[PDB]
């Protein structure tokens, strides 16, 4: 499928172990697509003093669309020393890998992938 239905759980900033993807634009969107896949994908809602805490490259999901069922429809942009990679709509969060921290919430999303 063009599109698929995921609902990533959302992590605290502190709590989180692993603050990215990788050390590339090119690898931290394909770490990204994979955990997304696997079920491995944490999701941190950007605020002040979010960003400094997490490791650059960053990855965004962002609205591509204004939600069948509930997703809302997102693609990815990555962000290094402030270019980004990817032309999308506004911010939910910034992705990292979920490794058994305990969501406070789960945003339902529907990924182009």
């Given at each position: 499928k063009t599109h698929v239905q995921l609902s990533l759980p959302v992590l605290q900033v502190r709590d989180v172990?692993?603050?990215?993807?990788?050390?590339?634009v090119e690898e931290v969107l394909s770490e990204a697509r994979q955990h997304l896949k696997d079920g491995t994908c944490g999701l941190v809602e950007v605020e002040k003093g979010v960003l400094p805490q997490l490791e650059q490259p960053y990855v965004f999901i962002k609205r591509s669309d204004a939600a069948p069922h509930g997703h809302v429809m997102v693609e990815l942009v990555a962000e290094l020393e402030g270019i980004q990679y990817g032309r999308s709509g506004e911010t939910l969060g910034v992705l990292v890998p979920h490794v058994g921290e305990i969501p406070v919430a789960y945003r339902k999303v529907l990924l182009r992938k």
């Open positions: 172990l692993v603050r990215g993807f990788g050390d590339s």
